[PDB]
């Protein structure tokens, strides 16, 4: 992580060297006016500017940072205040950093969910597949458009309570227009 | 101004008009059920990791806090809702193949039938791939001028090449998250829904012919007394010609000559709407990114330039206009997003009613799920949402028939029809009784 | 309410003056005798004055 | 704790929180410009009272 | 349900999916209390942004400049603050129209389900609706839909009417009913429940 001053552009980041050649001008900006790359004039090689500290998506379960949905690798988030076995996994789209060994955990109680990846209590990411059901129906009350065959009619029953919330009001606010733009 | 079946028939004892013949008409609708969620870092965006900036965000940590919580607690309500609606039954998923709908030629071509030519466009050939209609659809989103979805972020932190457009957005603290439901689960979800019509018996892998499925769904409108083979033909040919005019409107390939119907007008409502849906997500962000070059009445549009000209006692005043200028640029983005989350939450609420009452159940609310009396409905995937195919009834002929609504014999005993929808009438010297929905004497 | 601030609360070295004994000393900012090597920014002179 | 100080709460609900790190203090400098033949001047401002 | 709410009940350990119904609510109620104290405190705190002017208070401006030239300075306060209201107003009318959809939804759920046992499948819960109980909540209701769930089934051969001696036809009046033999005895049941 350096501090650069490249052709008048300025900022901090990590500069690397690559093997790719573009026949163009000196440097290459983003849509936000940040440096992405630049060309040395005395030779042909171009370099790549990457900012030093990318963001992370650390996951906390009960006053403890469990792991980080990160992008690079070895970002710290675990190390020290004074003065470990910090594993690093590889998902299809991102890295993942948590001190749990891919061995014999086999129990965790609470999960924090996302689209296909839920993180459970001992750092273990489970792949969230689609919930499999028997038949995509609740075979009573619906249309029963089958006759004269070997049909299946339900015998026993049980209930299941499912709660929902509906918001019906908002606390109204009466704003004086003249008082606000100038207090009298 | 009526579709005279399924509605109330509040006329008796007159010269009433009861429909005889019928035909179907397919009308498609689109419903958008998800939006690609975006996780925005508040602190990275207003200053890209500058150390002197973050000692000035401490004055505004109230404003920075709400912006993150407005986005997460809108996004988390999606994934909790979407993961509890989309269910795939693997038993019925193995019936969605078009080869299943052809391989049962015992007697007739059972698992297809006369409706096989229209259903060949909707069902996938093998277990798990998009069908013919979505293949026409997804050739109108890349040719719309867009398209990339497999955004790896491991390539973003490598420095092998000059940065991609997507990786450049990540550097400013804007994460385009993956879609909460991908294209593959939507392909699995809709294909599981159509399999519920071919599957009725759980513990027997034999399947019901689709001609039995429609013949059953006619009975819930009115109890069919006599059924003929000719009635199966006119329903099926009008069904298959409906899908072909649908297919010709989509990707300009079918087998016809020239036809100007009104199924285009159902289709043009969809294709305009799908064209807009892909054209939001790439445009709110690129407007938000491009507001990192507006020096809001300051020296330069980059922060590290400011701290290398001025001293800290006076550079803070210059960078203050960057902070309050950029913090307003987030609230312009956040309020536009929460518009869409609440708007989708109405449409996703609409999709649960249409999936449950119409795709699974043949609802009897007139006008809902199409236009007229609902027979069935088939779904397909689409860019961020479903694409319905409501099949409604349509009458063609009628019967001028004099009616009564009960018998009085010898002016002593009265008799009234138990069902009110029924009505009594003579029919070539013979008195019959029929519902006023269909001519089923 | 709550607020964030950069406050001086990093107590390097606490020196309890007894009330009775001798209410007079010197305090050096940089490397005093009552604290071995370290150098601080403020002296928070806490009291019931 | 940096998440907690950014959240203004002593206890967090479990979930996903965008965190990062304060970067460093001392960084080696880097200055690249178009190459040119050196012509360097030394002007000083001098005040005598 | 009670164990998910305030972490007090009488059980041992149970991981069901009623939490997943409950977690949809407790996230939503947590957001609803967290709007009203935050749009205003953002709007109040825009009375310290001197929009390219001398100071963020008006009476300071009129005690430095004369009226022929102080009006130009206070003009940027007015047009700056008037835009700060429209940023607040449009955010509010977003919520009034959004609630008006949800309040429209609450009239359907109260009338068709709390009072009436609606028969629209899937509406008011997940499956066939039995009843529903309500409770208060911060700014809105909290429903408790009680749906039916089947567990067992009956593999049964069926018919849908009788033809006797190839002369007379007989069809079931209800279409939902179906006829079937049952240990040598012919019965008739709906195809919803096994009620022979
Ligand atoms: C809305 O309404 C619908 C309808 O009422 C409700 O839908 C019902 O939901 C329930 C619960 O989700 C379904 O019951 C079953 O769910 C099982 C999964 O839960 C777990 O238990 C199983 C063991 O039974 C574990 O294996 C699972 O563990 C998981 O993780 C491992 C990894 O370690 C994976 O490998 C597994 O695959 C799991 O992901 C969970 O702990 C599910 O397994 C069960 O499966 C049935 O179908 C599969 C299909 O292959 C069969 O193989 C399996 O044998 C079951 O088939 C039937 O036969 C057995 C006889 O042994 C019966 O006992 C079963 O009841 C079943 O009939 C099944 O899916 C239920 O099926 C579903 N539908 C109905 C009609 O009840 C929804 O809950 C309600 N809410 C929502 C939001 O939809
Ligand atoms: C210059 O002048 C100033 C001004 O006088 C001097 O500052 C004063 O210093 C006083 C202490 O020296 C302080 O007096 C009290 O401090 C108490 C805390 O310590 C008490 O408790 C411990 C042991 O507690 C254990 O048991 C108790 C119950 O018995 C439990 O509650 C605890 O959790 C422990 O389990 C004892 O060892 C001490 O002897 C004390 O009892 C406060 O508790 C106490 O009053 C509290 O209750 C009052 C109502 O009766 C309330 O008005 C007051 O605000 C306190 O409430 C506070 O604490 C409770 C604890 O639960 C908390 O819930 C409340 O929210 C709140 O935090 C006294 O505060 C003086 O307050 C302090 N200033 C005042 C007003 O005089 C200063 O010393 C002096 N400098 C010099 C000369 O050096
Ligand atoms: C979009 O939708 C339109 C509207 O339906 C479709 O156009 C129809 O296309 C079909 C197929 O070509 C037409 O059906 C055929 O009609 C023929 C007779 O038409 C003449 O005679 C009738 C009266 O009898 C007149 O009304 C009409 O104007 C013509 O003068 C028949 O010969 C065909 O039947 C023969 O072949 C079929 C097998 O293909 C056998 O089943 C029969 O036994 C028989 O030998 C046939 O049904 C239909 O007329 C067209 N409709 C209109 C309004 O023109 C488009 O095809 C559709 N686009 C698609 C699917 O892409
Ligand atoms: C719908 O349900 C019906 C009721 O279950 C089904 O009829 C059953 O079909 C199965 C087919 O596997 C038959 O089971 C077979 O039985 C034969 C032997 O049957 C012969 O011998 C026995 C005595 O051993 C005698 O009782 C019979 O009358 C026959 O003479 C075995 O060789 C097979 O391995 C197999 O077990 C049932 O016997 C049959 N039951 C009846 C009452 O007919 C029907 O097939 C189903 N239709 C479907 C699924 O489409
Ligand atoms: C409801 O429907 C009923 C059935 O159609 C209607 O009754 C019909 O009403 C029309 C009125 O235009 C009659 O048609 C007229 O017929 C007379 C001649 O009828 C007399 O002579 C013929 C033999 O030629 C004989 O069959 C009759 O019994 C009469 O003695 C013509 O002069 C008129 O131009 C006209 O054509 C029908 O005859 C009549 N049918 C029956 C079975 O009564 C009824 O009017 C309708 N009610 C309404 C619309 O309110
Ligand atoms: C997450 O859920 C996904 C969807 O359910 C899972 O994908 C499924 O993975 C299973 C594994 O059993 C596949 O089952 C397959 O069985 C076939 C046999 O089919 C072959 O023959 C048929 C015709 O008879 C032909 O059409 C097929 O193409 C095959 O030739 C095996 O060949 C397969 O390899 C596999 O065993 C499901 O089909 C597959 N579903 C889909 C739609 O892809 C996924 O595995 C799950 N991931 C988990 C649980 O971690
Ligand atoms: C830019 O120009 C400045 C003005 O000349 C440069 O400052 C000069 O730096 C050189 C470094 O060698 C000094 O030379 C040294 O002088 C000291 C003693 O300094 C005192 O005595 C000298 C006697 O000549 C007197 O001129 C000074 O003012 C002091 O009174 C010796 O001990 C060293 O061995 C060596 O001779 C110059 O003295 C100094 N000049 C002044 C006026 O400061 C400066 O280095 C230039 N900066 C660059 C090139 O980056
Ligand atoms: C639906 O299925 C039919 C017939 O079903 C097929 O054959 C049965 C015997 C079973 O084995 C089924 O499992 C199998 O799918 C398919 O019909 C095919 O139709 C075409 C004409 O449309 C026939 O092709 C012709 O073959 C003759 C020589 O016999 C040539 O002169 C022609 O050049 C032409 O190729 C084809 O033979 C016939 N296929 C079979 C298996 O007989 C139909 O294609 C299918 N529809 C689909 C998959 O969409
Ligand atoms: C206030 O009282 C304190 C003591 O409470 C005084 O400080 C002490 O002063 C005495 C001398 O009067 C010191 O004793 C000598 O210290 C030197 C250190 O090198 C040692 O070599 C001698 O042999 C002797 O021990 C004492 O160390 C010092 N510190 C203490 C004891 O706290 C302070 O001077 C008084 N302030 C006044 C009177 O203004
Ligand atoms: C504050 O820290 C400094 C170091 O940064 C301390 O200075 C150190 O003092 C010790 C003790 O005198 C020195 O150790 C000595 O080493 C010699 C041999 O070289 C040995 O003969 C002595 O017996 C003793 O062990 C140490 O070298 C020295 N370090 C430096 C770099 O100066 C200072 O004492 C500390 N002050 C306190 C105690 O607060
Ligand atoms: C990603 O993580 C791995 C584990 O920390 C790092 O692994 C090696 O680091 C050494 C440092 O010199 C390299 O020489 C090896 O080539 C790395 N192996 C690989 C490919 O992982 C690795 O540093 C991190 N990422 C990279 C590309 O350095
Ligand atoms: C209206 O329905 C009737 C009865 O189904 C149809 O009448 C039949 O038409 C076919 C020609 O397609 C004839 O071969 C039959 O003999 C007719 N049957 C009777 C009893 O008349 C009639 O075609 C239908 N109308 C339309 C426009 O399709
Ligand atoms: C997980 O389960 C194992 C055995 O089932 C138990 O020993 C362990 O303590 C559990 N983990 C917890 C409670 O965190
Ligand atoms: C069928 O009925 C006969 C006589 O009613 C009885 O003996 C037999 O047990 C029944 N079969 C059952 C209950 O499976």
Residue numbers in the entry:
A (entry chain A): 702 to 784, 796 to 896
B (entry chain C): 848 to 1288
C (entry chain A): 310 to 358
D (entry chain A): 506 to 554
E (entry chain A): 1093 to 1288
Please, what does the article write about this entry?
CoV S proteins consist of 2 functional units, the S1 and S2 subunits, which are responsible for cell attachment and membrane fusion, respectively.
The ectodomain of FIPV-UU4 S protein was fused with a trimerization domain of T4 fibritin followed by a V5 tag and a His6 tag at the C terminus to replace the transmembrane helix. Using a 200-keV electron microscope, we determined the 3D electron density map of the FIPV-UU4 S protein to 3.3-Å resolution, which revealed a propeller-like homotrimer structure with an overall dimension of 180 Å in diameter and 170 Å in height. The 3 monomers are intertwined through extensive interactions between the conserved S2 subunits, while the 3 S1 subunits form the propeller blades. Based on our cryo-EM structure, we defined 5 distinct domains within the S1 subunit: domain 0 (residues 1 to 275), domain A (residues 276 to 540), domain B (residues 541 to 695), domain C (residues 696 to 754), and domain D (residues 755 to 791). The S2 subunit consists of an S2′ cleavage site (residues 969 to 978), a fusion peptide (residues 979 to 1055), and 2 heptad repeats (HR1 and HR2), corresponding to residues 1056 to 1156 and 1342 to 1403, respectively. Through different image-processing procedures, we could unambiguously build 28 N-linked glycan structures onto the atomic model, including 2 N-glycosylation sites, N585 and N590, which were not identified by LC-MS/MS analysis of the de–N-glycosylated peptides. In the case of N357 and N1218, we could resolve the densities that correspond to 2 GlcNAcs and up to 5 mannoses, which is indicative of these 2 sites being mostly glycosylated by high-mannose-type structures. Compared with the cryo-EM structure of the S protein of human CoV NL63 (HCoV-NL63), which represents the only reported alphacoronavirus S-protein structure, domain 0 of FIPV-UU4 is rotated 90° with respect to the adjacent domain A. Such a pronounced conformational difference could stem from the extensive glycosylation at N254, N357, and N491 that wedge between domains 0 and A. Among the 4 selected alphacoronaviruses, FIPV-UU4, HCoV-NL63, human CoV 229E (HCoV-229E), and porcine respiratory coronavirus (PRCV), FIPV-UU4 S protein has the longest loop 1 in domain B with a distinct helical conformation, rendering it more solvent-exposed and potentially more accessible to host receptors than that of HCoV-NL63 (19).
